Design a binder for this molecule. Structure first.
Ligand SMILES: *Cc1cc2c(cc1C)nc1c(=O)[nH]c(=O)nc-1n2C[C@H](O)[C@H](O)[C@H](O)COP(=O)(O)OP(=O)(O)OCC1O[C@@H](n2cnc3c(N)ncnc32)[C@H](O)[C@@H]1O
Ligand SMILES: *Cc1cc2c(cc1C)nc1c(=O)[nH]c(=O)nc-1n2C[C@H](O)[C@H](O)[C@H](O)COP(=O)(O)OP(=O)(O)OC[C@H]1O[C@@H](n2cnc3c(N)ncnc32)[C@H](O)[C@@H]1O
Ligand SMILES: OC[C@H]1O[C@@H](O)[C@H](F)[C@@H](O)[C@@H]1O
Ligand SMILES: OC[C@H]1O[C@@H](O)[C@H](F)[C@@H](O)[C@@H]1O
Ligand SMILES: OC[C@H]1O[C@@H](O)[C@H](F)[C@@H](O)[C@@H]1O
Lengths: 577, 574, 52, 104
């Protein structure tokens, strides 16, 4: 660990890795700190789902997720337990216990909001969905030139797609995928388009998909190394980044203050450029712990000197969810080209089709999988192969359906009685609403209570804003009821519901982007530079200022590429010495 | 390529053979069907992160997420509120991975396996007690002091490999609070001490828990630190069969399936060691022509190892949680003088250091004083960073169960989260089960598992007689003992846990002096009878009824086994 | 069920369970107000909740 | 087989049934309010001895039924409430409301 680097990056998630990839590749001497540790195999920061064993037992993965989602703000618990033994110590009050946050209004919370601390961040477990925002969800990068704005976003998304290895064809031959794709396509012909969810993933074999992550973006290996002898990069896990030090003028960051969790020592680190990619909650925390915004309960009679917009206008998506059990009609159509003689098991069961017949509803590759399944597994009442991959379907956000959609299969933990249902029949539905950015919607940090890393305790003051946001949320739900009925009825125990607020983990605008600090009520410019500071940059979904329904990380990613382009032009790599 | 020794499995018992045989100069290859999963220290405890020890309840999820059930019976739950448009089958057909061979009523439904490098030692609770004689297999016949001397030699080396100690929780208030109250309640009848734990404390808020990595770091050798050693570890490799010669006196190769490339090979070595877990050793063996494939059928006894898969033992496990008695909580602060009222500029809490009226030592009173003064909003006297209780009274004739009075990673019902965790103490009492022929683990000749190997099926009941009377007696004793510390926590009431959830299965490939007479598969060298060069390591080797956590005993047996190996096989020159 | 159908609880405290998965169009409380016959006099930690 | 053990509770001044002067019940009468804890001392200690006792005794007949594990029931479910208008020889001395003819 050196006194001094060209660039320090706080955070080893997919956004921090975007800056590393860009800046390391451009010859800068880079240090990356992460409060969390390497725990994903020898590919540093990779997707934890890329193990043979997880893709052979894919619902087990839900425990890896739950294992590294640490709730951001838990209100004080007021459940009554009155069947303790009379000899047991019993509370007189609902005192602050088990890390709960006495600042937190339980009825104005993002109680589902959660953070992850391992090298690679949440990209070690994410679902890899990477759609582009259309204009109506997207921040402007060029004012008064819609053509140029469109071209600048295309350029940027395209580069991100390649950093993430986004594609739309890795489930092209899933029977279940096409079954659902086709049904929906027909059902909404002339009204809505359906396609594969774009996913950051490379398919390696019919039973194995290499899901992308931070490691895809940048491999997080220390450089110089044989494969990159002239580059300089060092990653320091288990290092709590606590403050960036402001100069007296509020124009420049002078050091980064760290805390090696393993030794316990605190150190200051110097760099020309400082990049904060700690995630939407912890970017704000660090900034506030550093004197930006306002430490403590917000107090309009006391506006803060720096970044009065920090931790205001926050957004989080409504998320509605259910599962379906595939319709009989659809299951039957799976084998509509099949000619079936005899009875399953007896020596003369025959299942056959005619390759290439015009009256065939399905293509050959589909019918051949169906025939082989049915012939090799006669005790099985279903036509879908055991190894068929999962569906991965969406109709993207449009003005007449202003929500994102995913009609797919995500790792899930099954209740007893749902395990009763053949999993081949089950399809998850998640619709995601966009939330209007409102000043009263706050993430703030307490000036008394501290978290597990002795930083100021995050506290949400949030409600889904009345008006469009609420109307759309409820409309979205109905649209999920309606669209889902066409594939199947609801699976008991996974009935249509709104999910706990923030469980969706798509928080934005905590440190939002805009052209002008005061006029756009924002904290960073389109280079993601903090206003007033030469050398302080933020990357992450916190930069997103708009109301969006699609999954945000691709977009955050594109902003960080633009940011990097400003850094490349205005700071200079130290000589390689 | 040709190795001197191949080992199947990278868990702590395979790592035992590695450390013993790598160090003695052998060219060792080790194969695991699982992948490198614990950061840069290969095979290390997953709970050795700063984040887990600050969020320790989270760790439950790591465990659950690498425990894959062995044998799930076909599901017959009735869901009769599907929409009439939804596809529904007319039978409870074989679905979702379930085993049609499995009698739901004679199962160990909580039995499960972990396929990761370091095996289950990447998540275990690290409890390493010795077996006393009542629980322990004989390694010398008719000479108890010699047996004792051999077992102590081996246990002592095993404890240095795992870094067992009883001193890591010495300065916990909860630990001492619970330890002294039980030491007093049972003055003159039972002894209590710290659970022996494989672990080294690095700070007052961080324990470096041991694992297979502790036993052997699993780095390829030679390397800068061990330039004269030879070791290769190969993850993501399913080992499937050992090939017997026609005479059934030697193993001729190991058949593997590399899951990444997809290739299938036959690996040759001089010595083959199977340490793939009490379930999977048995599976590879049966898939190799040992014992009997398929539903057991007596009128057709197997050529080899007729005892394989029989006499299996699993422990009965009872559990509850307690919420600390008012009395004990107050006793934490008995040495305190309490002036004024918390929160006001006046409040004092003091003690006098070294006073002989004092019930507790200075170090404890100091911690209590400071917590009480610094958190005057907090109604309790135990500090927030105070490490967990780790207490046991070891198995004895009059109380023939092992006991843990402690805190494991736990997933709290949120009604249970209403209760402050400094007050909660876990109780787990572990029973010993008689080895009986009829209790069996066998493999289907038709059904296969997620790796295409013959599907595991249990036919098991806790034997009648002592096994059952002790299990009931054990549950009563937990109710009686726990009561002395506090009353049960709602939602964690005294219960038997799901059979096999305890994961302490043994005797699947059991050890004894004589194959026939002692109904067994390996001798006291863990050498498979008849075979020159095949060894089994693991809890499957343990042939007795045992209450205490079996792993260290397994490790001791493995160490002896390596002595035979070293005395009988020449390392190739390097 | 006969029993349970003629046990009317003597004193039910104000209910502080968080329901935060309402639809955003549904009327939502700002506080745990006095609802559905509950007794705001009642300390939930010093009750005979099962008294009926 | 069901097992129910019922304990005795020391009469304590501070354990109270009182009535609101603003809140009314379904029949427009003052709303009953409890201020109650099982007294520390003998009551508590016997309570927990009683639990242990049920555990020891029941084991003699069979092991517990899953779903019906030994537990304390909700304070008051037992509907054995007394002492609210309690009998005694002398009002003041025996802290009471009716004499041994139950006359106020
Ligand atoms: C959990 C989850 C995430 C999902 C999702 C599924 C799940 C269950 N799938 C998604 C997908 O399908 N589409 C997509 O766009 N989003 C999905 N997401 C969210 C995605 O995972 C996040 O949007 C993304 O990681 C954000 O990237 P980031 O901006 O790089 O932030 P991340 O949290 O990943 O990394 C930040 C980190 O930095 C650390 N940290 C935090 N505080 C500190 C301090 N103080 N010092 C040093 N480091 C610090 C972390 O440990 C972490 O790695
Ligand atoms: C899961 C767990 C276990 C546990 C415990 C609590 C939990 C929840 N805590 C315990 C305690 O406090 N101490 C005690 O002694 N034991 C405790 N345990 C059990 C303990 O972890 C196991 O006894 C021990 O891990 C057994 O070690 P062993 O090395 O014999 O086996 P393993 O850990 O299962 O690793 C074996 C491996 O081999 C692999 N494998 C399996 N099949 C194949 C094939 N066919 N080919 C190649 N490799 C194979 C595994 O993937 C594994 O790593
Ligand atoms: O459960 C919420 C999550 O679920 C998946 O379906 C997603 F793609 C993510 O955008 C989101 O994180
Ligand atoms: O869950 C069962 C496990 O729990 C622990 O408390 C013990 F240490 C283990 O031996 C055991 O494997
Ligand atoms: O539920 C408590 C009730 O249960 C029965 O067992 C008793 F007969 C009663 O004294 C009592 O009122």
């Amino acid at each position: 660990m050196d006194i001094k680097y060209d660039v320090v990056i706080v955070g080893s998630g997919p956004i921090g890795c975007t800056y590393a990839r860009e800046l390391v590749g451009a010859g800068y001497k880079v240090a990356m700190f992460d409060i969390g540790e390497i725990d994903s195999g020898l590919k540093i920061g990779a997707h934890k789902k890329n193990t043979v064993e997880y893709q052979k037992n894919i619902d087990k993965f839900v425990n890896v997720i739950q294992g590294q989602l640490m709730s951001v703000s838990v209100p004080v618990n007021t459940l009554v337990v009155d069947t303790l033994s009379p000899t047991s110590w019993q509370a007189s009050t609902f005192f602050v216990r088990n890390g709960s946050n006495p600042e937190q209004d339980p009825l104005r919370n993002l109680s589902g909001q959660a953070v992850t601390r391992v090298v690679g961040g949440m990209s070690t477990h994410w679902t890899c969905a990477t759609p582009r925002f259309d204009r109506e969800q997207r921040p402007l990068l060029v004012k008064d030139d819609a053509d140029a704005d469109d071209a600048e976003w295309d350029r940027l998304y395209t580069k991100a797609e390649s950093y993430f290895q986004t594609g739309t064809d890795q489930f092209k031959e899933s029977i279940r995928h096409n079954l659902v794709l086709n049904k929906l396509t027909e059902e909404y012909k002339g009204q809505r388009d359906f396609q594969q969810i774009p996913l950051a993933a490379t398919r390696r074999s019919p039973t194995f998909v290499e899901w992308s992550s931070a490691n895809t973006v940048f491999d997080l290996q220390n450089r110089p190394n044989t494969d990159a002898p002239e580059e300089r990069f060092n990653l320091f896990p288990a290092v709590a980044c606590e403050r960036v030090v402001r100069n007296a003028l509020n124009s420049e960051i002078e050091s980064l203050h760290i805390h090696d969790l393993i030794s316990g020592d605190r150190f200051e680190i110097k760099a020309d450029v400082y990049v904060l990619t700690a995630g939407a909650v912890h970017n704000t925390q660090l900034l506030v712990n550093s004197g930006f915004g306002q430490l403590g309960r917000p107090n309009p009679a006391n506006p803060p000197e720096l970044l009065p917009s920090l931790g205001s206008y926050i957004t989080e998506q409504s998320l509605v969810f259910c599962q379906t059990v595939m319709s009989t009609e659809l299951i039957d159509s799976v084998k509509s080209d099949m000619t079936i003689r005899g009875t399953p098991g007896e020596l003369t069961y025959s299942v056959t089709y005619t390759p290439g017949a015009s009256t065939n509803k399905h293509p050959d590759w589909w019918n051949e999988k169906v025939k082989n399944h049915m012939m090799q597994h006669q005790e099985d009442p279903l036509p879908i192969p055991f190894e068929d991959p999962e569906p991965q379907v969406t109709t993207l956000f449009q003005p007449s359906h202003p929500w994102h959609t995913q009609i797919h299969r995500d790792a899930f933990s099954w209740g007893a009685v749902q395990q009763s249902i053949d999993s081949r029949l089950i399809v998850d539905w998640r619709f995601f609403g966009r939330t209007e950015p409102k000043e009263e919607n706050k993430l703030w940090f307490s000036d008394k209570i501290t978290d597990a890393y002795n930083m100021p305790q995050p506290t949400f003051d949030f409600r889904f804003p009345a008006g469009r946001t609420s109307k759309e949320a409820e409309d979205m739900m109905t649209d999920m009821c309606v669209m889902s009925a066409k594939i199947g009825g609801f699976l008991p125990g996974s009935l249509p519901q709104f999910m706990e607020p923030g469980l969706v983990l798509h928080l934005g605008g905590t440190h939002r982007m805009g052209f002008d600090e005061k006029e756009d009520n924002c904290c960073v410019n389109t280079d993601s530079r903090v206003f007033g500071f030469k050398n302080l940059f933020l990357g992450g979904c916190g930069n997103i200022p708009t109301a969006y329904g699609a999954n945000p990380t691709l977009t955050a990613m594109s902003l960080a590429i633009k940011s990097c382009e400003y850094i490349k032009q205005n700071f200079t790599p130290s000589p390689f010495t």
